[PDB]
Amino acid sequence: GMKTIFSGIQPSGVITIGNYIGALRQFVELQHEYNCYFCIVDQHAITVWQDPHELRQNIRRLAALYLAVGIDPTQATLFIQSEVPAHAQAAWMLQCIVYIGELERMTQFKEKSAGKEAVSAGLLTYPPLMAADILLYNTDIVPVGEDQKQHIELTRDLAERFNKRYGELFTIPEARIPKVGARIMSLVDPTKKMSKSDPNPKAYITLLDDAKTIEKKIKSAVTDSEGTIRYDKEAKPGISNLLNIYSTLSGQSIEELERQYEGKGYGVFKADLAQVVIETLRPIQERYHHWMESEELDRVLDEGAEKANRVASEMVRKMEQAMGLGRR
Amino acid sequence: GMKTIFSGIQPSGVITIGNYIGALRQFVELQHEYNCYFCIVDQHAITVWQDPHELRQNIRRLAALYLAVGIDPTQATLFIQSEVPAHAQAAWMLQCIVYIGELERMTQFKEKSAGKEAVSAGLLTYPPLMAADILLYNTDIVPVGEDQKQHIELTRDLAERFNKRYGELFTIPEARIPKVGARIMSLVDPTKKMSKSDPNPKAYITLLDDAKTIEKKIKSAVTDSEGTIRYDKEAKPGISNLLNIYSTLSGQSIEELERQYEGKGYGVFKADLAQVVIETLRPIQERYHHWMESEELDRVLDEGAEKANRVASEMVRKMEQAMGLGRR
Ligand SMILES: Nc1ncnc2c1ncn2[C@@H]1O[C@H](COP(=O)(O)OP(=O)(O)OP(=O)(O)O)[C@@H](O)[C@H]1O
Ligand SMILES: Nc1ncnc2c1ncn2[C@@H]1O[C@H](COP(=O)(O)OP(=O)(O)OP(=O)(O)O)[C@@H](O)[C@H]1O
Ligand SMILES: CNC1=NC(=O)[C@H]([C@H](C)c2c[nH]c3ccccc23)O1
Numbered sequence: 001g002m003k004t005i006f007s008g009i010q011p012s013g014v015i016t017i018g019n020y021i022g023a024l025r026q027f028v029e030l031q032h033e034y035n036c037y038f039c040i041v042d043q044h045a046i047t048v049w050q051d052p053h054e055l056r057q058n059i060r061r062l063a064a065l066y067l068a069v070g071i072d073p074t075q076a077t078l079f080i081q082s083e084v085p086a087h088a089q090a091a092w093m094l095q096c097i098v099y100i101g102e103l104e105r106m107t108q109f110k111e112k113s114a115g116k117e118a119v120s121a122g123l124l125t126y127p128p129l130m131a132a133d134i135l136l137y138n139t140d141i142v143p144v145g146e147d148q149k150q151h152i153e154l155t156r157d158l159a160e161r162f163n164k165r166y167g168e169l170f171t172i173p174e175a176r177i178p179k180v181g182a183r184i185m186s187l188v189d190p191t192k193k194m195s196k197s198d199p200n201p202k203a204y205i206t207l208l209d210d211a212k213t214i215e216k217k218i219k220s221a222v223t224d225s226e227g228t229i230r231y232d233k234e235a236k237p238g239i240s241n242l243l244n245i246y247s248t249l250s251g252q253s254i255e256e257l258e259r260q261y262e263g264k265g266y267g268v269f270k271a272d273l274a275q276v277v278i279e280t281l282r283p284i285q286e287r288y289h290h291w292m293e294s295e296e297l298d299r300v301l302d303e304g305a306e307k308a309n310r311v312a313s314e315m316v317r318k319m320e321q322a323m324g325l326g327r328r
Numbered sequence: 329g330m331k332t333i334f335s336g337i338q339p340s341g342v343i344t345i346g347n348y349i350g351a352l353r354q355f356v357e358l359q360h361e362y363n364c365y366f367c368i369v370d371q372h373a374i375t376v377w378q379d380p381h382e383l384r385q386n387i388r389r390l391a392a393l394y395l396a397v398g399i400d401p402t403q404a405t406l407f408i409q410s411e412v413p414a415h416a417q418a419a420w421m422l423q424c425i426v427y428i429g430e431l432e433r434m435t436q437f438k439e440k441s442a443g444k445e446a447v448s449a450g451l452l453t454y455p456p457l458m459a460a461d462i463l464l465y466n467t468d469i470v471p472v473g474e475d476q477k478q479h480i481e482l483t484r485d486l487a488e489r490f491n492k493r494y495g496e497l498f499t500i501p502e503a504r505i506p507k508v509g510a511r512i513m514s515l516v517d518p519t520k521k522m523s524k525s526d527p528n529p530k531a532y533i534t535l536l537d538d539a540k541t542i543e544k545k546i547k548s549a550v551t552d553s554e555g556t557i558r559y560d561k562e563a564k565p566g567i568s569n570l571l572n573i574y575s576t577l578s579g580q581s582i583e584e585l586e587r588q589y590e591g592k593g594y595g596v597f598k599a600d601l602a603q604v605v606i607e608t609l610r611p612i613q614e615r616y617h618h619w620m621e622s623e624e625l626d627r628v629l630d631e632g633a634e635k636a637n638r639v640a641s642e643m644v645r646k647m648e649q650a651m652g653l654g655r656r
């Protein structure tokens with residue numbers, strides 16, 4: 001049969017052009033060639049503080065945006081993580097498989113915890129939850145951005161450990177990281193990736209930003225003083241990132257854009273890029289407002305959770321049977 | 329209405345006279361005065377390696393022993409933890425509430441991990457699972473042995489944190505630790521508690537040990553060379569522990585036993601204690617074999633899980649609503 005895809009996005013804010021370019025844009029292509037599960041992973045979002053009203057709102061917005069960008073609910077399964085208890089069940093079992101040392105050495109943990117104050121346990125232990133998200137659906141392929149590469153590697157290790165300790169049950173999944181746009185950088189700090197939970201809203205463009213806002217954010221994007229538009233990731237990380245965004249959203253190659261802007265300044269380059277982004281987001285936002293106004297949004301998520309529960313609950317039964325939990 | 333009790337025992341082996349004296353014996357009394365939930369916590373057991381066949385077997389044996397000691401399934405709710413998904417769901421939410429530092433400072437973790445080799449994450453993170461076990465049922469009272477005192481204190485902290493961060497939802501539970509027998513000591517190392525997962529079977533007496541075996545284990549119990557039977561926890565921890573077991577199982581006070589064995593040796597004292605233990609276990613074992621032979625054991629657990637799911641799933645809904653997970 002068809003190979004299986006699973007991917008998740010946190011409702012920790014409104015998704016960014018980084019999320020779009022790095023992941024969501026490819027979901028829309030993949031849905032026709034694979035058995036696809038695309039998840040709103042709200043249990044991942046609460047690994048740090050979320051205002052309850054904002055979280056509820058962002059869950060619905062993410063669902064609407066999934067559909068607005070062109071995911072077809074008849075070709076892919078769209079659902080909310082917490083509405084499928086199997087994810088928490090399998091997460092616990094995999095927490096008993098993973099070693100503490102493996103979690104502590106994770107790059108993303110050591111980064112998000114540096115400055116600690118106090119760190120929730122969830123921030124340390126979300127990787128086995130992610131592994132459960134993937135392994136529950138006998139997933140073959142996991143489309144993600146570059147920053148999730150190590151997490152997929154851990155998932156593969158956990159799957160193999162379980163398989164050899166108890167018996168062959170899990171498919172060993174493989175990451176699919178796009179050749180371009182797998183790490184869109186922050187607009188205000190071109191050495192960090194763009195993150196939808198950045199405390200500085202200028203760092204990112206959300207798919208729901210209006211024209212004025214996008215113009216402002218691109219205008220204030222950090223650049224060098226050299227005044228020349230060419231790609232150089234080491235010497236010109238800001239302009240390089242903007243070129244990468246321009247390129248993947250316009251269809252023009254970086255090399256083509258360099259020529260188009262030969263003898264031109266950053267001012268006109270930024271003004272142009274803003275409009276490219278705006279025109280890209282325009283049809284997305286129109287369809288988004290449609291979904292936010294309808295009961296059909298809830299019906300899609302209802303049906304998706306129904307489907308996901310049937311598949312995931314069966315895998316939980318098999319996992320329990322392998323470990324000896326519960327009863328025959 | 330009636331106040332609510334919750335307590336759990338791991339199917340990590342066959343329960344001991346330590347488990348009996350410290351917890352299970354009091355369950356049988358409490359069931360008539362309170363709304364009681366008594367749980368076979370198999371998700372706790374897998375925080376360390378369990379052979380799947382042994383685990384399945386120990387789950388059933390624990391259920392049978394719960395009933396054999398006199399727990400009435402019409403007066404208390406008896407169920408298996410993994411058959412109620414709400415425990416894993418609530419555990420994850422509480423993992424996002426607890427801080428890593430709080431888990432690392434737990435005495436039981438620092439002890440069970442010293443020697444580390446490799447430590448499962450579950451061994452670090454089972455306290456929030458325990459907190460979920462308790463808080464899901466609006467529990468007022470938690471009957472446990474001394475070693476779980478710090479865990480109940482953490483549970484109270486987590487409940488308060490949730491209540492003040494989101495809104496009053498949880499009852500703040502209170503530990504009930506018996507005045508006598510809250511920490512029965514190992515037979516081979518009187519400075520450690522008796523534990524059903526001890527690698528040395530001589531350390532404990534299980535409720536299923538036969539007469540020959542009990543005689544052997546009591547005979548080899550570590551004692552001093554002083555040859556006098558009197559209670560002195562510091563100077564005579566072995567004989568003191570044996571006196572404590574003799575006392576709580578026979579009904580005689582320690583002071584009475586000291587007199588009864590004045591001018592007597594450890595040999596006759598140990599031979600007598602063995603028979604006291606044997607006669608205590610005799611009716612328990614008879615009823616145990618009855619339950620292991622019947623389909624009614626499964627029917628009891630079916631009904632218990634049904635009841636527990638109704639109560640716990642509703643609390644999960646309230647927790648999710650408070651945190652903003654899922655949908656309205
Ligand atoms: N700058 C980026 N470029 C490309 N892909 C990204 C970027 N940031 C995140 N992603 C991808 O989008 C996905 C969803 O991740 P996530 O929901 O964590 O978004 P995020 O922006 O990192 O939010 P948060 O700041 O809350 O971590 C993952 O597949 C991840 O690889
Ligand atoms: N020596 C003991 N004396 C009194 N109570 C005990 C003793 N050991 C455990 N308990 C109690 O019995 C309970 C069930 O605990 P648990 O299932 O962890 O048993 P355990 O013997 O500690 O097993 P393990 O060795 O797997 O930890 C708890 O309420 C605990 O306080
Ligand atoms: C904080 N949790 C988290 N950050 C991430 O980037 C991952 C993502 C969002 C994720 C969770 N489950 C997944 C399954 C497949 C692909 C990505 C994810 O989780």
Ligand SMILES: CNC1=NC(=O)[C@H]([C@H](C)c2c[nH]c3ccccc23)O1
Pocket residue numbers: 334335336337338369372373375454457458461462470471472476
């Ligand atoms: C390793 N897990 C663990 N050890 C313990 O002693 C506790 C006990 C068994 C426990 C788990 N949930 C509970 C709820 C109420 C009373 C005791 C427990 O858990």
Ligand SMILES: [Mg+2]
Pocket residue numbers: none
């Ligand atoms: Mg992220």
Ligand SMILES: [Mg+2]
Pocket residue numbers: none
């Ligand atoms: Mg214990």
